[PDB]
Amino acid sequence: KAFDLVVIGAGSGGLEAGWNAATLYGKRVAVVDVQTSHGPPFYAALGGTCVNVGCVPKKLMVTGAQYMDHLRESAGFGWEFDGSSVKANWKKLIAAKNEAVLDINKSYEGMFNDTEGLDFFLGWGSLESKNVVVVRETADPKSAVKERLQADHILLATGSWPQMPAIPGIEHCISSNEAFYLPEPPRRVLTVGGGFISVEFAGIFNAYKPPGGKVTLCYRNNLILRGFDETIREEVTKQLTANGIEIMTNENPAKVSLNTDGSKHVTFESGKTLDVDVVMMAIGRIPRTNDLQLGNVGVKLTPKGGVQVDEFSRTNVPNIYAIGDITDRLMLTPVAINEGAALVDTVFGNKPRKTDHTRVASAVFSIPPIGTCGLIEEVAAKEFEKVAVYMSSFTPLMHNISGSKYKKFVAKIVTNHSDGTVLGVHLLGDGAPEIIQAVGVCLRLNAKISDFYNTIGVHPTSAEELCSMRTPSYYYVKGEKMEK
Amino acid sequence: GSHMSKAFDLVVIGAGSGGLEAGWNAATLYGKRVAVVDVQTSHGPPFYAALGGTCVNVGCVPKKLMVTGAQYMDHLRESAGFGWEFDGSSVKANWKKLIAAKNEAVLDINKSYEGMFNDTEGLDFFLGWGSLESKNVVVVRETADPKSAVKERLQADHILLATGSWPQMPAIPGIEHCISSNEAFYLPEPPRRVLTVGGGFISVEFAGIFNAYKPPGGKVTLCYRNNLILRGFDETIREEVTKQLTANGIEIMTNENPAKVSLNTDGSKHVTFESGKTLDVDVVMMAIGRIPRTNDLQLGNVGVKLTPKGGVQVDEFSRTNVPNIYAIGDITDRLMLTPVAINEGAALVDTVFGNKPRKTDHTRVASAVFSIPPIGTCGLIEEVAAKEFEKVAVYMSSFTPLMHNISGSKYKKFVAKIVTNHSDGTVLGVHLLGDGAPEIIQAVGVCLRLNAKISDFYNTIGVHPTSAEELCSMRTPSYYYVKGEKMEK
Ligand SMILES: Cc1cc2nc3c(=O)[nH]c(=O)nc-3n(C[C@H](O)[C@H](O)[C@H](O)COP(=O)(O)OP(=O)(O)OC[C@H]3O[C@@H](n4cnc5c(N)ncnc54)[C@H](O)[C@@H]3O)c2cc1C
Ligand SMILES: Cc1cc2nc3c(=O)[nH]c(=O)nc-3n(C[C@H](O)[C@H](O)[C@H](O)COP(=O)(O)OP(=O)(O)OC[C@H]3O[C@@H](n4cnc5c(N)ncnc54)[C@H](O)[C@@H]3O)c2cc1C
Ligand SMILES: CC1=Nc2ccc(Cl)cc2[C@H](c2ccccc2)N1CCNC(=O)c1ccco1
Ligand SMILES: CC1=Nc2ccc(Cl)cc2[C@H](c2ccccc2)N1CCNC(=O)c1ccco1
Ligand SMILES: [Cl-]
Ligand SMILES: [Cl-]
Numbered sequence A: 001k002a003f004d005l006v007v008i009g010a011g012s013g014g015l016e017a018g019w020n021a022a023t024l025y026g027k028r029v030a031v032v033d034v035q036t037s038h039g040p041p042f043y044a045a046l047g048g049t050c051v052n053v054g055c056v057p058k059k060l061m062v063t064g065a066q067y068m069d070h071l072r073e074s075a076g077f078g079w080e081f082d083g084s085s086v087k088a089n090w091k092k093l094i095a096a097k098n099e100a101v102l103d104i105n106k107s108y109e110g111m112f113n114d115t116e117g118l119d120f121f122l123g124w125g126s127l128e129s130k131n132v133v134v135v136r137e138t139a140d141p142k143s144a145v146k147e148r149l150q151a152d153h154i155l156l157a158t159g160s161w162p163q164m165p166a167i168p169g170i171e172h173c174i175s176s177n178e179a180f181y182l183p184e185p186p187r188r189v190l191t192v193g194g195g196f197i198s199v200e201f202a203g204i205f206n207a208y209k210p211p212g213g214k215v216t217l218c219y220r221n222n223l224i225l226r227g228f229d230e231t232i233r234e235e236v237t238k239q240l241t242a243n244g245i246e247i248m249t250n251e252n253p254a255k256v257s258l259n260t261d262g263s264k265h266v267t268f269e270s271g272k273t274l275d276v277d278v279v280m281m282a283i284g285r286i287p288r289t290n291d292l293q294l295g296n297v298g299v300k301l302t303p304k305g306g307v308q309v310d311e312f313s314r315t316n317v318p319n320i321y322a323i324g325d326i327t328d329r330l331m332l333t334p335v336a337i338n339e340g341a342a343l344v345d346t347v348f349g350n351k352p353r354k355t356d357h358t359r360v361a362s363a364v365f366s367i368p369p370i371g372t373c374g375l376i377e378e379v380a381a382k383e384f385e386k387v388a389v390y391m392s393s394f395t396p397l398m399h400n401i402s403g404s405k406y407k408k409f410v411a412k413i414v415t416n417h418s419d420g421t422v423l424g425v426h427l428l429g430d431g432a433p434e435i436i437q438a439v440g441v442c443l444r445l446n447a448k449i450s451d452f453y454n455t456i457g458v459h460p461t462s463a464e465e466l467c468s469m470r471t472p473s474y475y476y477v478k479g480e481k482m483e484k
Numbered sequence B: 001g002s003h004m005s006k007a008f009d010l011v012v013i014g015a016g017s018g019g020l021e022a023g024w025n026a027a028t029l030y031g032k033r034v035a036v037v038d039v040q041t042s043h044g045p046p047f048y049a050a051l052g053g054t055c056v057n058v059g060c061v062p063k064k065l066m067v068t069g070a071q072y073m074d075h076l077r078e079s080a081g082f083g084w085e086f087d088g089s090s091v092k093a094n095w096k097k098l099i100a101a102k103n104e105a106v107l108d109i110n111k112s113y114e115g116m117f118n119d120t121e122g123l124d125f126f127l128g129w130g131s132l133e134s135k136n137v138v139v140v141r142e143t144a145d146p147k148s149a150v151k152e153r154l155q156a157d158h159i160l161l162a163t164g165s166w167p168q169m170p171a172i173p174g175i176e177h178c179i180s181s182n183e184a185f186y187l188p189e190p191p192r193r194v195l196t197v198g199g200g201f202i203s204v205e206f207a208g209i210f211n212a213y214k215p216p217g218g219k220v221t222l223c224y225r226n227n228l229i230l231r232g233f234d235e236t237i238r239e240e241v242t243k244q245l246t247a248n249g250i251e252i253m254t255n256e257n258p259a260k261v262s263l264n265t266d267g268s269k270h271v272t273f274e275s276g277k278t279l280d281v282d283v284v285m286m287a288i289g290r291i292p293r294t295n296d297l298q299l300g301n302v303g304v305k306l307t308p309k310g311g312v313q314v315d316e317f318s319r320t321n322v323p324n325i326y327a328i329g330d331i332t333d334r335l336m337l338t339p340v341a342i343n344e345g346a347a348l349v350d351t352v353f354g355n356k357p358r359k360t361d362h363t364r365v366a367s368a369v370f371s372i373p374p375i376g377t378c379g380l381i382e383e384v385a386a387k388e389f390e391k392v393a394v395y396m397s398s399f400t401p402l403m404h405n406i407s408g409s410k411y412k413k414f415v416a417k418i419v420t421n422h423s424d425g426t427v428l429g430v431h432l433l434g435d436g437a438p439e440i441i442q443a444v445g446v447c448l449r450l451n452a453k454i455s456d457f458y459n460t461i462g463v464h465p466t467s468a469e470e471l472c473s474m475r476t477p478s479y480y481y482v483k484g485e486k487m488e489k
């Protein structure tokens, strides 16, 4: 048939857009994805990346990894049990996680079957013509048609995909997609990348590794987590190191060779070499524009490969839009959901609406975790004459007793010191992703450091630290960092 | 001949949350000479509170360490769903190691605060019992008995009453066979059977603590004289916490109140309730309330007025009816929270000795209950809002989060409620039940001070996946109050 909306990709942005359209505006909706439940061969599926091979499973797996610390820390509070009997059963975790994700898949299939004006179609979506969306048997454009769908408006929402550098032996490496399905936990693993996915997986592999195991993370520059607060980048590095993860900075794989025993011999650009069981490449993610045949209608892409869009998600082709990681702005699930909701408002609603990409709160589920919203001091120091930085950094008391003395909680607020406006807040330590959520609301109300400081603390919490700081630790004046 | 009393700009009676913030500020920000009196320099019996106050010695700080310890019962069980394996029959909760660990942690804070007195010019500590001899004279005596020897007679321009509160022990037969939270912190063994009496945060928290450490075959029971524990808290939350305590094996007896306690011949306690019901326990912990600790201060010497309830009456600036005598913290019977006593102490010193007169805002204060899982709350419950606002909206989200399907703790429903003035969207109250609630609520306290509306919450982009994001994903009320009445408009 024909439809008001055809959505390519049943993901965060797509499922949101295609549900608002059918339930808030009774529109006729088609949504195409390549698989109806998680895992190989195509990994993402109905629900999107986040649901099948992203935020949702990774969080359950980091929750599993945190028991390594809980079991050990328990002793400090007088819990006694046979330490030598402890094992981390990876196969149970992955089976548990598989069932959880499968239940969400089935449940999203429920909602298709029970909603009129919202139809899901299995297969590979491409642009045949200005208002025709083909669905083929496979990603091969030469492959058999399953459907041609007519559509007023077409939404491009096919997400992103791991970036695999084209070094010799790249094909002996996995990405996070495969990481979710390893049948054994690796004894030696190299995670390649200094960003959140590399870090988060290093912490997961670190808890589930067999006896004698070792996690090594490498990164081509000097300090991991570029784009995060610098004190926190250094402190997470120390805390990952304290929990046994080896961090190799200033190193980059130039070649991977397969050993006869299935292991990998990694050669670095420096000529250093390391043998491991698994190389997980997590150096970035790229917009998933390749199989869409965007040539067939001349939809433009940026120097970086992402669908180019204006503030309202419109491509250069009338009646064709793009939201989510395909656009290459902020690769976060709730950003994509916001974009998709706003699109449908601006197209079958009365009020135009655009997604604000500033002041978006986000989290790294490292162990210990990170919670941030707003500008880091070095970005602030370039756009503002006077910047103040309020910092508190204490190993909390629970962690003196636990034995995890290396677990410092870090709280920083960055301000425009001229009028006291909070430019950014950056947290490291247990609960940080939860603490920062309503911080994002504050930054929307143009909170000042005195609005924080004058709110009465909840005690005892890590969070109250944010309402106890009234004196700057230091400043940037005209870009120059200084004491007073 | 005669010689001079030690003289101060400020004498603070009670070295606790409020008194220490006041004393510190007056001395280090405004150059005042400050005396601070407390009955002990470190935690524990005979007097329990000490240098640092109730929170440091026998309140928030040790209790949170004990609750963290109690949480490992759940973690060790929950870990099995994520694939952790170990010998479950080897598991034991060693109460003695917990108490030893917490004592050490509290003693280091006591030592640290004493070092701060020693290092800080114009800030002096006095060990003993402080009382008002006259409008500008504080005397410190050997014991709480007003006839015990005077150790020091202090000249004081200004006097701050900051002696806190004390457990309320009902006048029933066998009350002397009961304890309070004070003694709970020092039990040599974990009790096998305990009754916590009261339905407020202290009874509830200690019920979870004793539940985790009790020996084989033990039972924890909490009773409350009324229908539903945790009066003052959101009603959905009160009912969920009740269910979640029950699920973890605590016995909740509502509409029951002890009428007497007798000692059994084995030393256990035989509790008879008003209703005629009875219960045998090893420990009866009375946690039915805390009363302003005004009795040893000899306030009649100077005519400081009490309220009908027994707090020192003060105005919005912490002034009593007697010039240069002030009262902050639990002794004033407003909100008994450590950071409120702190805020009162800062505001009072700013007003008296600074150039910034200021009063504490007791509305929209965030607080927590360290139940397992915990409560975080800030602002009005809906039944209070409905009485003051013509249209009130209630946004509710509730569900067992996914980790807890996998963990096996399916009774663990997260609840998030936002209560609004519906005529303009202003958030009046936010109520949370679930893991990390106390941590989530802190920045909510800031939102409310900025008069955030629901539309600010909803407009903010979620952090995924968190429980906190539920607050930013709610756009349609679950129901309303229209002049006092519940419906969906
Ligand atoms: C390991 C990992 C962890 C992450 N963790 C977080 C986190 O904690 N928090 C957070 O906010 N974000 C996280 N993200 C990012 C988040 O998953 C993405 O930002 C989000 O899913 C983007 O949504 P989308 O709508 O743009 O696309 P997706 O949710 O990726 O959906 C795209 C869909 O299109 C389908 N598809 C692709 N091509 C076609 C085609 N040609 N025809 C039909 N269907 C097609 C795919 O099967 C996929 O289901 C994580 C990502 C990864 C990889
Ligand atoms: C078990 C328990 C748990 C608690 N948990 C929390 C929590 O998690 N969060 C929270 O915010 N609040 C909590 N509180 C409450 C918090 O402890 C109090 O609100 C706070 O300590 C009150 O501060 P204050 O300055 O009034 O007095 P306190 O901190 O009680 O200090 C008063 C001091 O005066 C001393 N004193 C008394 N009489 C005399 C005298 N005549 N002469 C000299 N000194 C004297 C006492 O020794 C004491 O050290 C808890 C309380 C209890 C009992
Ligand atoms: C609103 C919504 N947004 C989504 C955003 C991103 C994802 Cl990955 C999933 C959803 C989800 C959904 C699930 C199936 C089809 C379309 C949307 N979904 C549906 C949630 N609501 C209900 O199922 C519901 C049932 C009854 C009333 O509302
Ligand atoms: C500001 C403050 N407020 C308190 C509020 C409540 C309590 Cl219970 C304790 C304090 C603490 C303090 C500790 C000793 C004497 C007076 C104040 N105290 C001082 C903490 N120490 C410092 O700020 C410090 C010590 C050394 C350098 O800075
Ligand atoms: Cl395994
Ligand atoms: Cl890299």
Ligand SMILES: [Cl-]
Residues within 6 Å of the ligand: A221, A222, A223, A226
């Ligand atoms: Cl760098």
Ligand SMILES: [Cl-]
Residues within 6 Å of the ligand: A193, A195, A197, A198, A282, A283, A284, A285
């Ligand atoms: Cl990446």
Ligand SMILES: [Cl-]
Residues within 6 Å of the ligand: A369, A430, A431, A432, A433, A434
């Ligand atoms: Cl967290």
Ligand SMILES: [Cl-]
Residues within 6 Å of the ligand: B093, B094, B095, B096, B097, B189, B190
């Ligand atoms: Cl014991």
Ligand SMILES: [Cl-]
Residues within 6 Å of the ligand: B197, B198, B199, B223, B224, B225, B226, B257, B288
């Ligand atoms: Cl009671």
Ligand SMILES: [Cl-]
Residues within 6 Å of the ligand: B226, B227, B228, B231
């Ligand atoms: Cl009641």
Ligand SMILES: [Cl-]
Residues within 6 Å of the ligand: B198, B200, B202, B203, B287, B288, B289, B290
């Ligand atoms: Cl009480």
Ligand code: NA
Residues within 6 Å of the ligand: A452, A453, A454, A455, A456, A457, A467, A468
């Ligand atoms: Na504050």
Ligand code: NA
Residues within 6 Å of the ligand: B457, B458, B459, B460, B461, B462, B472, B473
């Ligand atoms: Na939102």
